[PDB]
Amino acid sequence: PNLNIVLTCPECKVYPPKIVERFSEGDVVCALCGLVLSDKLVDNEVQAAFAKITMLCDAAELPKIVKDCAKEAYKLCHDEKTLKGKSMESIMAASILIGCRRAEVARTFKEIQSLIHVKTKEFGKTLNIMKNILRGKSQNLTYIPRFCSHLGLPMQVTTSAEYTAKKCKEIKEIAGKSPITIAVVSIYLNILLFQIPITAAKVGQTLQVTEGTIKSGYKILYEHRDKLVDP
Amino acid sequence: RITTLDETVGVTMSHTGMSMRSDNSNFLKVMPKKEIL
Amino acid sequence: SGIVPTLQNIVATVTLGCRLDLKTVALHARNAEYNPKRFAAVIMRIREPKTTALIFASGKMVVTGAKSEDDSKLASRKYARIIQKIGFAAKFTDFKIQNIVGSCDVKFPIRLEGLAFSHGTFSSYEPELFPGLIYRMVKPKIVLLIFVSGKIVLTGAKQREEIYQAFEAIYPVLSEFRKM
Amino acid sequence: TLKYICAECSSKLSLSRTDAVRCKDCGHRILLKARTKRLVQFEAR
Ligand SMILES: [Zn+2]
């Protein structure tokens, strides 16, 4: 009920307040008549969830920003009707993957699936409903460097792979059959361009892509070798 | 003594975090009614 | 345009009105399957129209596999006659189509990521989980599966016009997001 | 856009906003601010 205080110059009165504030003198003054306006300026469910979530993101070594985006997300979902279940494992993984997305970081469905057993398809449905709720409350490329890390590849290899991913997506032809296959194949091409051996089975194991898949991607990718060359 | 792993360090970290690799080992994986009666 | 969706599957329900002895039904039908341990219904089939029926003890029946509404009612009446012929006091009632599936080809590739970004509140696209974009239309309330190839799947319809309505409504959008 | 410099290779970048922060041609995330072009005056006193 009212209670809002406004500062106005009784001698000026011309405008609303147009003033400056002097922190050192700790006083506030009308900039016009130079009058001092003021003086002596002074200088249960949830907690359990965020606990286990905390543990999960921690083991995942995700930076606190991601952790906190997921926390925020989860609070919004919380107890709502439409969720109607999922036992608290699905929600924690969903909210996590969200906070990853929203944080511009990328994590594969498989990776989170390695931290938690969500049964997969059930996970997709929960993730979609949560996504819908966020809209109501109103991009593979990042994966490419992360994979190099796993292989410990030189920088030039990584950037080559980035050019390769953009070029491959534009040329279409299979649309990608999920991004993961394209990211790994793009690498496999780029590395085979260079002399550095990973061979094949080692990358298929290490990065968990079916060897047949990498070779299959390789043939079509090989066909378009013409236009993928950065220099 | 203690042995220092000399690798590119990327491979070791990939195995550390979420690796997209799971399982591969198992530990704590955890007469009718008339005549009948 | 010029493209009109093709109907691919029609699912219907029918009330027979009397209780059934499933072992008897399965035993007497010419084309029946019944394993109580797997599913609680006799899976009966007829050759014309080629369909499959799920027959329950309550006398309720689900008929699926038909490509037209005509074929659905026809095959349903036929299944009901079989039950009668086996000896139960069945009646063909409450025939109602519950789901209609349709599909077509727009003949050009589509940019799913652009579409998902633009029509975000109706779209769901996770290419690593499933390659098609799931579009949930408001009016009519139809679900469309959109693929990079330009092939389209429409489902959730109770009437044929809804399949036709949804495609007409989606076509301009698919055009806006074409690749060539 | 505004001109920056890499940490190590000292290459001129001039990356724009929403490019995050990284060098192109190497991974160093340390970017120098590429000294002002306009003239600065001193008194030798
Ligand atoms: Zn004043």
Ligand SMILES: [Zn+2]
């Ligand atoms: Zn540099």
